[PDB]
Amino acid sequence: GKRQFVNEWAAEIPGGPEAASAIAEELGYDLLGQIGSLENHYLFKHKNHPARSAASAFHITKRLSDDDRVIWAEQQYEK
Ligand code: NA
Ligand code: NA
Ligand code: NA
Numbered sequence: 001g002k003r004q005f006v007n008e009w010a011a012e013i014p015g016g017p018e019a020a021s022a023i024a025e026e027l028g029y030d031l032l033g034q035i036g037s038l039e040n041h042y043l044f045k046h047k048n049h050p051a052r053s054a055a056s057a058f059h060i061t062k063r064l065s066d067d068d069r070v071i072w073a074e075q076q077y078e079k
Helices: 018-028 058-065
Strands: 005-012 029-034 041-046 072-078
Touching: 005 058, 018 029, 018 041, 018 058, 058 072
Parallel strands: none
Antiparallel strands: 005 041, 005 072, 029 041
């Protein structure tokens, strides 16, 4: 069938793991850890957005991507 989005975001943060934790705190996420195919790819879990929704939360992605420490960000679909 079709998949819903989860309240988790992947992001590329070249500044590294300390920056990842600082970004999470500032923008309202828990850091989940490292993912992806590159070293400085991190997964975040938003502290307030619903765990599961059909909504594509483009506005949260834009806030994350708009931080200059974050060069790329992507809301994740559920598995
Ligand atoms: Na929901
Ligand atoms: Na950015
Ligand atoms: Na994106």
